[PDB]
C-alpha cells in the first residue's frame, strides 16, 4: 500500500519528476547506483538525481513527515503473502514445492464468459531480475481464445510490453480473467479464432463451451509449516529396533530427512510431468525420479518397495485404509494431499502417493536401522542426532543422498 518495488511501507520516500515514488533503499539500489531511470516508466532522472543528491533533497519531506501517523526472492514471498491477504476472485496461485520461482496458478472460467464451470491451470516462472522483468505466464490447459494459442502463450500487453514493477501476480491473474471475458480480436495470437469471433460470435461461444467441456473438466502452496512424521517414524523404529528410542531432537532430523526426500522426488516428478506434457503424476514419474536421484542399491531397493506397495494396493480390498491396503505405516492419503497441495501437477494418480509413501518408509527404516546400530555401538539405548550423523556418514550411499542435509 506504499512502495511499488519492494511491496513494503515507504521509508524516506523519494518522488521523481515522473511522480513515481519508491523508498530510499529501492531508489539507491536500482536508480542511483546504475540505471538513473525510473524503474516503473524508464524516465531519465539523471539531471534531477545529481542535483538533489548533492543538496540532500531527494527525500520527499512533506510525504515522509506526515506518514508517521535476494530482492527477487524477498518480493516473491511478499506477493504470496499479499496473495493470502487479499485472495483474488476466481484465482489462486502458489509455488511448486519449495521452488519460489516456479508457481502453479488456477483460473475458474468466469461466469460471464463461455468458459464458465471450467478450471484452467497456468504455469508461472519468475525471472532472476523480478520485479524488473516480467513473469512468464502460460496456460497448460487447452482453451479456445483469440489471444491464447496451442503452446499456451498469452498475448497480453502487461505480460510483455506494458509490464511494470508496480504490477503484481494477483493483478496479472485478474487481467487474464478479464481477457477471458473480453477478448481482443483486433490484435490476435490465433487469427482463425479471432476471425470467427469477429464474424460468427455464436460459433465462437459454441466452440469455447465444447473446448471447456472437453479439456477443462493452484493453491496457497506447500506453506511455511514444517510437516512432521513422528507418528510413523516411531512405528518404523518399533519394527526395526523395538528396544531403542529416539530423542525429540533426533526426531526433528528424521522429519528433515523425510521432507527433503519428499520435496526432491516430487519436484523431479513434477519436472518430468511438465517435460512430457502430462497433466497427471503417476507412479511412473515417481519411479523415474527415484531411479535418477537415489544412488545404487538404495534406488534398486526403493524401486522394489514402491512396485510391491502399488501391486499390493491394486489387488487389496478397497474397504480398508489406503496405507493398510499398501502394507505401509506411512500415510498414503496424506502423501496424496501433499502432492496436490504442493502444486506439482494438475492431477495426482492414486498409485503415486502409495509408491512415494513406500519409498519414504523404506528410506526411514534404512536410516533408523543404521542409527540404532550406531547407538548400540556407544552402548546407548536412545537415538540422538549424533547417531543419525554417524549412520549417514558411515553408509556411502546414504551420505551421497542425505549428506547435504544439515545435522546439528
Ligand atoms: Cl536526465
Ligand atoms: Cl508463453
Ligand atoms: Cl498413479
Ligand atoms: Cl539430487
Ligand atoms: Zn521499496
Ligand atoms: Zn516514473
From Swiss-Prot:
GO terms for cellular component: cytosol; endosome membrane; extracellular exosome; nucleoplasm; nucleus; plasma membrane. Phosphorylated by AURKB. One of its GO terms (biological process) is protein polyubiquitination. It is found in: Cell membrane; Endosome membrane. Pathway: Protein modification; protein ubiquitination. It is a peripheral membrane protein. Its EC number is 2.3.2.23, 2.3.2.24. Its main location: membrane. Disulfide bonds join 91-177. It is an enzyme of class 2 (transferase). PROSITE patterns: UBC_1, UBC_2. InterPro entries: UBQ-conjugat_E2_core, UBQ-conjugating_AS, UBQ-conjugating_enzyme/RWD. Pfam families: UQ_con. Accepts ubiquitin from the E1 complex and catalyzes its covalent attachment to other proteins. In vitro catalyzes 'Lys-11'-, as well as 'Lys-48'-linked polyubiquitination. Cooperates with the E2 CDC34 and the SCF(FBXW11) E3 ligase complex for the polyubiquitination of NFKBIA leading to its subsequent proteasomal degradation. Acts as an initiator E2, priming the phosphorylated NFKBIA target at positions 'Lys-21' and/or 'Lys-22' with a monoubiquitin. Ubiquitin chain elongation is then performed by CDC34, building ubiquitin chains from the UBE2D3-primed NFKBIA-linked ubiquitin. Belongs to the ubiquitin-conjugating enzyme family. PANTHER family: UBIQUITIN-CONJUGATING ENZYME E2. This is Ubiquitin-conjugating enzyme E2 D3. It comes from Homo sapiens. The gene is UBE2D3.
